[PDB]
Amino acid sequence: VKSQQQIIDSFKQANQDQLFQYYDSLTIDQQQEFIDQLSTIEEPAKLISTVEQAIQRNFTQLPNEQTASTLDLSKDILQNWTELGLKAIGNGEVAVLLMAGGQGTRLGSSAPKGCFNIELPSQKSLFQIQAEKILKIEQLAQQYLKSTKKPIINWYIMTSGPTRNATESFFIENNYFGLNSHQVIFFNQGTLPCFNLQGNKILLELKNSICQSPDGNGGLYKALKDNGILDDLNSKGIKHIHMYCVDNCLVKVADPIFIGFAIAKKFDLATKVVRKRDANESVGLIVLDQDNQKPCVIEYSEISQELANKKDPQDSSKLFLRAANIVNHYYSVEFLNKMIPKWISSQKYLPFHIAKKKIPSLNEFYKPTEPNGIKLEQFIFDVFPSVELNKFGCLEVDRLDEFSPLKNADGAKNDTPTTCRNHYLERSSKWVIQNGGVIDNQGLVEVDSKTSYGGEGLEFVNGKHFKNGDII
């Protein structure tokens, strides 16, 4: 490590003299704490350079050979992928990577987003729904293979540094929701300094502290390496990884169909999409970059308003680019072993993305009105074009069964606790009604994962009646 003076010199040489405006009026402990914080920043000179650089497109649809759809495949082909997936789960070759993010502040909660309660009749948090989803599929895999005990699906949860304790305590308080305490593994995501609007000066949060924020889901790769997560994957002999975001309340965790799909096709990388809701839906789009003939994702905050509304040449009723990204990825561990060192070393695969933000910080503190600074983010999918086109898979699935994100506080039209709650109940009710069950008009039921992972094993409800709010 470096001395007090050396950290100060390096930052000053990087033109961050403003970080030391009040240094001399700080107590010694405040100075030492400041230096320690500035120490966690690897290569400030580079980083400030990278940011500076980051401040200063032909797409088409994915070739047909790289796509498949759960809405079009025969039940036999889907069953075969399900079996290939349950076998991998059953052999202990499947692990899950969760991007937990940080606090559900935007939703009106200080707690981690995974603790959010969408008010289902069971009152189960997002974390609990995903945990029972995992427990359930482990049992279905055990049944398929006829094993004496259920297989284990290690669940690596990436938390932000500030939500780490509250996330782990929540799991402990709940006895891990039925999972083995050793299969829930927590690791912290990194952070990046926040900059002023011109992106040349790091912002002071306090007179002895800089503004920092989670470095985006794209920072998952470096966090994996640094926290020994990739090491663990090798030590446990894991071959397949399913990665998703905690805000999707309908998420099929460790979905065997998605894994079977990658296995059947021998893909290094694969991703899930659903038909775009509307031209303005804030959703990334999976396309083929015609320039380099590589798959990629165009984020909603960076796509041309012209491309977003472009109609499809072979059909005027459809949007040309309509394969919406639902942050649901598959990686083979072999691919991660080969590519992670590459992805984390050069900005070519993980360029920084700039987002203007209202950031509470020194002018004396103050919570601003208009944007006053910038947050930096690496996007998880920026590595997609580093894959070989024929090793990439894109699986379209049904939005009604697989995607309903919690993004906004109640009040908004889309992606609120209410839309999640209703879509969740509507799916449960559809499964029940579809198996002969009868729900009393105006009623919606909730299906417990313990009962059904994704609609199977519900035949027993044939003829039975249910009342609004029953849990099945």
Q: Would you say 375 is a known binding-site residue? A: yes
> Smallest gap, in angstroms, from Cβ of residue 445 to ligand GN1?
26
> Smallest gap, in angstroms, from Cβ of residue 137 to ligand GN1?
22
Is 376 among the residues that bind ligand GN1 (CB under 6 A)?
no
Please tell me the count of residues contacting ligand GN1 according to CB under 6 A: 12
Tallying the residues shown for the chain, one arrives at 472
Question: Is the CB of 192 or the CB of 324 nearer to ligand GN1?
Answer: 324
Question: Is the CB of 263 or the CB of 319 nearer to ligand GN1?
Answer: 319
> CA dihedral in degrees (188, 190, 196, 201; nearest 10)?
140
Task: List, in order, residues 6 or more apart from 383 with CB less than 8 Å away.
Answer: 218, 221, 339, 343, 349, 350
Token pair of 78, please?
């889907």
- From the list 33-41, 75-83, 255-263, 322-330, the region that binds ligand GN1 by CB under 6 A is 322-330
Question: Is the CB of 105 or the CB of 434 nearer to ligand GN1?
Answer: 105
Q: Would you say 189 is a known binding-site residue? A: yes
How far is Cα 150 from Cα 32, in angstroms, rounded to an integer?
A: 50
> Smallest gap, in angstroms, from Cβ of residue 351 to ligand GN1?
12
DSSP per position, 13-55:
HTT-GGGGSSGGGS-HHHHHHHHHHHHTSS-HHHHHHHHHHHH
> Smallest gap, in angstroms, from Cβ of residue 1 to ligand GN1?
33
Q: Which residues bind Mg ion (CB under 5 A)?
A: 64, 67
Q: Would you say 434 is a known binding-site residue? A: no
- H/E element, 140: helix 126-145
Q: Would you say 356 is a known binding-site residue? A: no
In whole angstroms, how large is the CA radius of gyration of the chain? 24
- From the list 126-134, 321-329, 392-400, 420-428, the region that binds ligand GN1 by CB under 6 A is 321-329
Q: Would you say 391 is a known binding-site residue? A: no
Q: Would you say 18 is a known binding-site residue? A: no
Judge residue 370's burial from the number of C-beta atoms within 10 Å of its C-beta, 0-12 exposed, 13-18 middle, 19 or more buried.
exposed
DSSP per position, 199-249:
SSSBPEEETTEE-EEE--GGGHHHHHHHTTHHHHHHHTT--EEEEEETTBT
For residues 194 and 212, the answer to whether their CB atoms sit within 8 Å is yes
Is 213 among the residues that bind ligand GN1 (CB under 6 A)?
no
Q: Would you say 436 is a known binding-site residue? A: no
**What secondary structure letter does DSSP report for 63?**
P
Q: Dihedral of CA 301/298/118/113: which sign?
A: negative
Q: Would you say 217 is a known binding-site residue? A: yes
Q: Which residue has the closest beta carbon to ligand GN1?
A: 284
Cα 375 to chain center, whole Å? 18
Is 100 among the residues that bind ligand GN1 (CB under 6 A)?
no
Q: What angle do CA 242, 237, 390 make, to 5 degrees?
A: 50
Q: In one letter, which amino acid is 188?
A: N
Question: Is the CB of 114 or the CB of 284 nearer to ligand GN1?
Answer: 284
Question: Is the CB of 61 or the CB of 79 nearer to ligand GN1?
Answer: 61
Q: Would you say 412 is a known binding-site residue? A: no
Is 378 among the residues that bind ligand GN1 (CB under 6 A)?
no
Q: In one letter, which amino acid is 35?
A: I
Q: Would you say 100 is a known binding-site residue? A: yes
> Smallest gap, in angstroms, from Cβ of residue 28 to ligand GN1?
41
Per partner kind, with CB cut-offs from 5 to 8 A, the member of Mg ion, ligand GN1, none near residue 67 is Mg ion
Q: Would you say 58 is a known binding-site residue? A: no
Is 119 among the residues that bind ligand GN1 (CB under 6 A)?
no
> Smallest gap, in angstroms, from Cβ of residue 67 to Mg ion?
3
Is 283 among the residues that bind ligand GN1 (CB under 6 A)?
yes
How far is Cα 243 from Cα 130, in angstroms, rounded to an integer?
A: 12
Is 104 among the residues that bind ligand GN1 (CB under 6 A)?
no
- Would you give the binding string for ligand GN1 spanning residues 217-236, x where CB under 6 A is met? x-------------------
Q: Dihedral of CA 456/462/464/466: which sign?
A: positive
> Smallest gap, in angstroms, from Cβ of residue 378 to ligand GN1?
9
Helix (H, G, I), strand (E, B) or coil at 8: helix
Which residue ranges are tagged as binding site for UTP?
99-102, 113, 189, 216, 247, 375
Which residue ranges are tagged as binding site?
99-102, 113, 189, 216-217, 247, 375, 407
Which residue ranges are tagged as binding site for substrate?
217, 407
Q: Which residues of this chain interact with ligand GN1, rule CB under 6 A?
A: 217, 282-284, 299, 324-327, 379-380, 405
